[PDB]
Design a protein around this ligand. Structure first.
Ligand SMILES: CCCCCC/C=C/CCCCCCCC(=O)O[C@H](COC(=O)CCCCCCCCCCC/C=C/CCCCCCCC)COP(=O)(O)OCC[N+](C)(C)C
Ligand SMILES: CCCCCC/C=C/CCCCCCCC(=O)O[C@H](COC(=O)CCCCCCCCCCC/C=C\CCCCCCCC)COP(=O)(O)OCC[N+](C)(C)C
Ligand SMILES: CCCCCC/C=C\CCCCCCCC(=O)O[C@H](COC(=O)CCCCCCCCCCC/C=C/CCCCCCCC)COP(=O)(O)OCC[N+](C)(C)C
Ligand SMILES: CCCCCC/C=C\CCCCCCCC(=O)O[C@H](COC(=O)CCCCCCCCCCC/C=C\CCCCCCCC)COP(=O)(O)OCC[N+](C)(C)C
Ligand SMILES: CCCCCC/C=C\CCCCCCCC(=O)O[C@H](COC(=O)CCCCCCCCCCC/C=C\CCCCCCCC)COP(=O)(O)OCC[N+](C)(C)C
Ligand SMILES: CCCCCC/C=C\CCCCCCCC(=O)O[C@H](COC(=O)CCCCCCCCCCC/C=C\CCCCCCCC)COP(=O)(O)OCC[N+](C)(C)C
Ligand SMILES: CCCCCC/C=C\CCCCCCCC(=O)O[C@H](COC(=O)CCCCCCCCCCC/C=C\CCCCCCCC)COP(=O)(O)OCC[N+](C)(C)C
Ligand code: NA
Ligand code: NA
Ligand code: NA
Length: 629
């Protein structure tokens, strides 16, 4: 009487008259609605989803009857429970459907008959957008009701009688509800609004219950707490909210991270918590994550909030500034040594060993100190291979460029050291590149000043955004004219001249003359020994006009558009450069020394478990407003 296609129509039509009678029919033939040959073959869908998906106007009275029929078959447990085994819906239930439809009335229902509030909606649809999915919310009904802007459900699901989803439950990634609100928060007004509300709500609510470990401390299956998870994913609205979190009510004051130490008229101190932000070695920290492992698109807005700017500046005072200016002179000196050993390197004979002299032994100190730097920069970069390397480090203006060139410098000293010992006399040519490359690595050390460091950033952008597109065209013209102009010179199959005849080097030198010529550095000085002399002169003039008057002076113009556009952007990169410099120094210290330079002051912010105080390191920031008396 009721086949598979029969019912899915009836319930999809949502009219509880045509279905009546399937109750006694099914009871007789020894069936239960969940049975295989009554539910869809592809997904695994049954009557109850199809009712809810095709819900209309907010209600549909088929469902209380199909559920009334459920206990008659005795499948309520199995009936409001089902893994759609579709590889796009691996775990969706009627409760996942009840909530996303904003259908409060049935969400109260479906849980009341004791269904589930923990089903892991693990389907590829229900994965993050980078796994090839559409909507991650966690994987749970409570994590959904939060992530779908439904406060009423979320309140209910907790303080509902029958069953309740604890606010602690982890999905199949470790991520709880707060982890999941960080996964769906974009940095828009409307999104950041209702994320922060519910984030607080559950966090303040979960303090009432389980008056123990904060739910914000629940690490997921890669550690990263909701704050650490926002810092890695670039979510300012939640990230900013968490740090300057000042709750006042006596119970939930351990949840605040911005205190009110003292005030006196229009001057107001304040005291931020650095529990996660600054952890010298013995914990993961937000600040390491931002400066190294995060979204580069907004990392400057992350390092420009409440302690983070003044916490790095404080490290710069203590050790950051000093140790950086030992690194520079240590490097500038090492390049003096690599210079003097090159100006006193001999130039006659296969390997110029024959030292046996106070000078040549002094040169020997030079090459050895050099090779020490090359093997150093080689290992420190390959240490970074098993450590901080493998982002897209080929064109970043945040030390991605120099990691290569110090590696090139490192390789290129090793090869010269290999050939100076393997007899080969091109130790020199390979060294010469290493030397020019090495001084051009001292631009790394312009990072300790906005003045010189912003400048060095504009050099490299202009080198990318402005100079390559210029050489593409410039080259393209040059082979065009040069070939065109070589064609108009008589061979030396004629009288052995270059300045009248052409043979075997005439192309190559023109490329240099036509290079000197556009640079404003060579003279025409018409060759004039040509079959057609007047066509020749007409072409060089078109080369000057196009390449000097028009391309190279347009190149100045384009730079002016570049430096105007990338000035601010270069100020913001430098702040990432500068911060990266500080932590590269800090990480290079032992832990006890990092704790000696520990930034902030220990404070009893308040009282906690059995009167135990809160010994939270914090960072004072005095402030003035002549407005909020
Ligand atoms: C977008 C426009 C592109 C223009 C491209 C240039 C075009 C030129 C078109 C005309 C072709 C001329 C052909 C010359 C042929 C040639 O060479 O014939 C010769 C000798 O010479 C003549 O007989 C011509 C005498 C007249 C001279 C005055 C020219 C006035 C030119 C005015 C216009 C200048 C444009 C200037 C550049 C402006 C560019 C601005 C935009 C920027 C983008 C490019 C071969 O001698 P032969 O007897 O075989 O043997 C040698 C014996 N002997 C003669 C030396 C005793
Ligand atoms: C407002 C405050 C104003 C104060 C301003 C003046 C401050 C001056 C501080 C100067 C000291 C810091 C610089 C030292 C040199 C340094 O650290 O050089 C670093 C590395 O060094 C080392 O590896 C050597 C290890 C030993 C260092 C400490 C020795 C000095 C100890 C004295 C500290 C003074 C305080 C306490 C006492 C210590 C005892 C325990 C506490 C007791 C209670 C107080 C250079 O960087 P590098 O790794 O090359 O850069 C990155 C390299 N990479 C990874 C990219 C390849
Ligand atoms: C990932 C990097 C690794 C590099 C790979 C290259 C390594 C090794 C190759 C070297 C060996 C090849 C020659 C072996 C045979 C030989 O010795 O051949 C010689 C001549 O050979 C050469 O001259 C080879 C050219 C060397 C330079 C290569 C490029 C070096 C690296 C280039 C990159 C660095 C630049 C940067 C530019 C700066 C601007 C950037 C700004 C960027 C700003 C952002 C024959 O002459 P002969 O007198 O007979 O020699 C004596 C022989 N006898 C008689 C004793 C047996
Ligand atoms: C191999 C042996 C080498 C022996 C050591 C030789 C070098 C020692 C370094 C001496 C300086 C370190 C202490 C600085 C403390 C301090 O006050 O640092 C800073 C201020 O100063 C600096 O930024 C360094 C000023 C420029 C140095 C010139 C180059 C020196 C090397 C050549 C405190 O932050 P702030 O004022 O917020 O920084 C903002 C920077 N702004 C606006 C004030 C300039
Ligand atoms: C308050 C002051 C206290 C002073 C304490 C002095 C303590 C110790 C002195 C020795 C310091 C050595 C520290 C080296 C730290 C280091 O690792 O340095 C490296 C730099 O490469 C080296 O060092 C090469 C190695 C060979 C030794 C140096 C040359 C030979 C010895 C010279 C020492 C004596 C100097 C100068 C003497 C004349 C001074 C005139 C003052 C005048 C003041 C105005 C830091 O590069 P990195 O950050 O890792 O960046 C790499 C790039 N990447 C990967 C991050 C992109
Ligand atoms: C390459 C490695 C890394 C290098 C980094 C350090 C480089 C240089 C050190 C310079 C430090 C001082 C500059 C601070 C400027 C500043 O902080 O602000 C600048 C203001 O600049 C100036 O007014 C003029 C600047 C030029 C002064 C010249 C004297 C210093 C050099 C020493 C003398 C050299 C001669 C001769 C030597 C003797 C020879 C005898 C042997 C001869 C052979 C026998 C911009 O301010 P603003 O517009 O607010 O922009 C924002 C920047 N802000 C404040 C946030 C950082
Ligand atoms: C994608 C296609 C790439 C194809 C590349 C094919 C490469 C080579 C083919 C040539 C093979 C022969 C060369 C042997 C080398 C040699 O030794 O040749 C010499 C010839 O003399 C020279 O001085 C060398 C002149 C070289 C000509 C280059 C032409 C133009 C090449 C253009 C390549 C660039 C493309 C594009 C630029 C894009 C720009 C925008 C960005 C777009 C990005 C996609 C042999 O001397 P010999 O005969 O013994 O004596 C001299 C002659 N005499 C006296 C007997 C009459
Ligand atoms: Na000129
Ligand atoms: Na000249
Ligand atoms: Na001249």
């Amino acid at each position: 009487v009721f086949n598979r296609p029969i019912l899915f129509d009836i319930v999809s039509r949502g009219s509880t008259a045509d279905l009546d009678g399937l109750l006694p029919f099914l009871l007789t033939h020894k069936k239960r609605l969940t049975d295989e040959e009554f539910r869809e073959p592809s997904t695994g869908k049954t009557c109850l989803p199809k009712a809810l998906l095709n819900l209309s106007n907010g209600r549909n009275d088929t469902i209380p009857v199909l559920l009334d029929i459920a206990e008659r078959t005795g499948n309520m447990r199995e009936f409001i429970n089902s893994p759609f085994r579709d590889i796009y819906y691996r775990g969706q239930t009627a409760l996942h459907i009840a909530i996303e439809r904003r259908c409060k009335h049935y969400v109260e229902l479906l849980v009341a008959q004791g269904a589930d509030v923990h089903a892991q909606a693990r389907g590829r649809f229900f994965q993050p957008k980078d796994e090839g999915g559409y909507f991650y919310f966690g994987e749970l009904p409570l994590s959904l009701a939060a992530c779908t802007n439904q406060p009423h459900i979320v309140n209910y699901l907790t303080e509902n009688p029958h069953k309740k989803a604890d606010m602690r439950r982890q999905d199949s990634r470790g991520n709880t509800v707060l982890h999941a609100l960080v996964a769906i928060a974009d940095n828009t007004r409307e999104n950041t609004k209702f994320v922060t509300k519910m984030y607080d709500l559950l966090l303040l609510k979960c303090a009432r219950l389980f008056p123990d470990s904060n739910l914000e401390a629940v690490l997921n299956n890669d550690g990263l707490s909701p704050l650490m998870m926002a810092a890695k994913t670039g979510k300012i609205g939640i990230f900013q909210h968490i740090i300057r979190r000042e709750v006042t009510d006596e119970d939930t004051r351990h949840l605040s991270r911005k205190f009110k130490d003292w005030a006196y008229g229009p001057v107001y101190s304040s005291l931020y918590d650095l529990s996660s932000l600054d952890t010298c070695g013995e914990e993961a920290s937000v600040l390491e994550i931002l400066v190294y492992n995060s979204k580069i698109e907004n990392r400057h807005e992350m390092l420009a909030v409440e302690p983070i700017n003044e916490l790095l500046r404080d490290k710069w005072r203590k050790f950051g500034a000093v140790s950086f200016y030992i690194n520079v002179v240590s490097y500038l000196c090492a390049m003096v040594i690599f210079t003097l050993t090159a100006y006193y390197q001999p130039l006659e004979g296969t390997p110029p060993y024959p030292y046996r002299t106070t000078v040549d032994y002094l040169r020997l100190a030079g090459e050895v100190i050099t090779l020490f730097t090359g093997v150093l920069f080689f290992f420190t970069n390959i240490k970074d291979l098993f450590m901080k390397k493998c982002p897209g480090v080929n064109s970043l203006f945040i030390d991605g460029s120099f990691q290569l060139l110090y590696f090139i410098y490192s390789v290129l000293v090793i090869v010269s050291a290999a050939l100076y010992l393997a007899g080969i006399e091109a130790y020199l040519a390979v060294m010469v590149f290493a030397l020019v490359l090495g001084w051009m690595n001292a631009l790394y050390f312009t990072r300790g000043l906005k003045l010189t460091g912003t400048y060095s950033i504009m050099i490299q952008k202009i080198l990318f955004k402005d100079l390559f597109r210029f050489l593409l065209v410039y080259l393209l013209f040059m082979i065009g004219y040069a070939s065109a102009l070589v064609s108009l010179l008589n061979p030396c199959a004629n009288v052995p001249t270059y300045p009248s005849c052409r043979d075997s080097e005439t192309f190559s030198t023109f490329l240099l003359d036509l290079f000197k010529l556009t640079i404003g550095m060579g003279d025409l000085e018409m060759l004039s020994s040509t079959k057609y002399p007047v066509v020749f002169i007409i072409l060089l003039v078109t080369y000057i006009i196009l390449t000097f008057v028009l391309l190279l002076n347009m190149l100045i113009a384009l730079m002016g558009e570049t430096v105007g556009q990338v000035s601010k952007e270069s100020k913001h990169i430098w702040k990432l450069q500068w911060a990266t410099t500080i932590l590269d120094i800090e990480r290079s210290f032992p832990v006890f020394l990092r704790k000696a330079f520990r930034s902030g002051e220990m404070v009893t912010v308040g009282k906690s478990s059995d009167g135990t105080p809160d010994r939270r390191w914090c960072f004072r920031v005095d402030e003035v407003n002549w407005s909020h008396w």
